[PDB]
Design a protein around this ligand. Structure first.
Ligand SMILES: O=C1C=C2C[C@]3(O)COc4c(ccc(O)c4O)C3=C2C=C1O
Length: 334
């Protein structure tokens, strides 16, 4: 008599009907390319799981980005490699070009296509209402594609979405947390960045699905249209859900815990307390006004739902009136 089980309401059995070895990444064997083809040019960022460089393929003077892994389980590395290969060539998915063994750390190093990114903390520089619809739609293209391939990204955030604004070119990146969906499976809830974790993770409900990425996406949407990143800013995981409740209200949240019989921490209820649902209008002011419309508001609201099963799918999201114009001028005769 623990929690109520859940299944994705779309793309449920996509993996069930793939041959093994589509999803059996443990089985996967890496074919290594040549390390000496690539020359590290400058460091871009350091993380706990990798170090990231801009590099040059000396064989053709093409720019690339190399992600050198820190020492890590074969399994976690094959998982990321398998997912990048399964998704390769999909819309707005970052293209893995090659896999080499770094000759200094003897660690696998992944080589991706190069994208001239503008950093998101500066991007909002003349970033209009239409830019947000367009890039949001581009992200949805990717999410629909990877979900339909039985894959959850589980780390959607501004930083994992690269944009070359000049060319209106976007890629979804960093698939090191991504996982294959199997109906009934109980996943690890230590995924995603704090600001973008869905209620299901915050309340330790492990049998989640693709739906998680849609919450993280609403978070991104909210921060962009309201000019406040991150939108939900808690000091820890507990407070994170307290931040969501203050906006979405505690009524809807306890309805969610009832429905799935989730059972909350002793006085998790303490810090949650009691909160009115807010009108999305209370986050509108004169410097975000122009990014905001009833369509943006309605769309947003159908993303940030406590109940994962009741959130829009990426496909459904694409069909929203918010994107009508974006769809119109992506219809090209060629
Ligand atoms: O496939 C990719 C591709 C990139 C390119 C790139 O976006 C460049 O710059 C980065 C970064 C990751 C962390 C970081 O701190 C940073 O600066 C990158 C990636 C991660 C991936 O999985």
């Amino acid at each position: 008599s623990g929690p109520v089980p859940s299944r994705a309401r779309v793309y449920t059995d996509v993996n069930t009907h793939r041959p093994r070895e589509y999803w059996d990444y443990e089985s996967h064997v890496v074919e290594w390319g040549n390390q000496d083809d690539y020359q590290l040019v400058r460091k871009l960022g350091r993380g706990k799981y990798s170090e990231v460089f801009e590099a040059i393929n000396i064989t053709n003077n093409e720019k690339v980005v190399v992600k050198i892994l820190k020492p890590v389980k074969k399994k976690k590395i094959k998982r990321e490699i398998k997912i990048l290969e399964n998704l390769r060539g999909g819309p707005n998915i970052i293209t893995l070009a090659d896999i080499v063994k770094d000759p200094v750390s003897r660690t696998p190093a992944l080589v991706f296509e190069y994208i001239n990114n503008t950093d998101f903390k500066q991007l909002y520089q003349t970033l209009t209402d239409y830019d947000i619809r367009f890039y949001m739609y581009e992200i949805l293209k990717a999410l629909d594609y990877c979900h339909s391939m039985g894959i959850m990204h589980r780390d959607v955030k501004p930083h994992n979405v690269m944009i070359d604004h000049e060319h209106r070119k976007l890629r979804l990146i960093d698939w090191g947390l991504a996982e294959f969906y199997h109906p009934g499976q109980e996943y690890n809830v230590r995924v995603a960045s704090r600001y973008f974790k869905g209620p299901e993770l915050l309340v330790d409900y492990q049998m989640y699905d693709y739906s998680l990425d849609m919450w993280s996406l609403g978070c991104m949407l909210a921060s962009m249209i309201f000019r406040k990143e991150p939108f939900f800013h808690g000091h820890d995981n507990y407070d994170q859900l307290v931040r969501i409740a203050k906006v979405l209200g505690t009524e809807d949240l306890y309805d969610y815990i009832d429905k799935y019989n989730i059972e909350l921490d002793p006085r998790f209820n303490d810090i949650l307390g009691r909160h009115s649902r807010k009108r999305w209008e209370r986050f509108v002011h004169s410097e975000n006004q122009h990014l905001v419309s009833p369509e943006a508001l309605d769309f947003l609201d159908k993303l940030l739902r406590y109940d994962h099963q009741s959130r829009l799918t990426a496909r459904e999201a694409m069909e929203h009136p918010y994107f009508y114009t974006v769809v119109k001028d992506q219809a090209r005769m060629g």
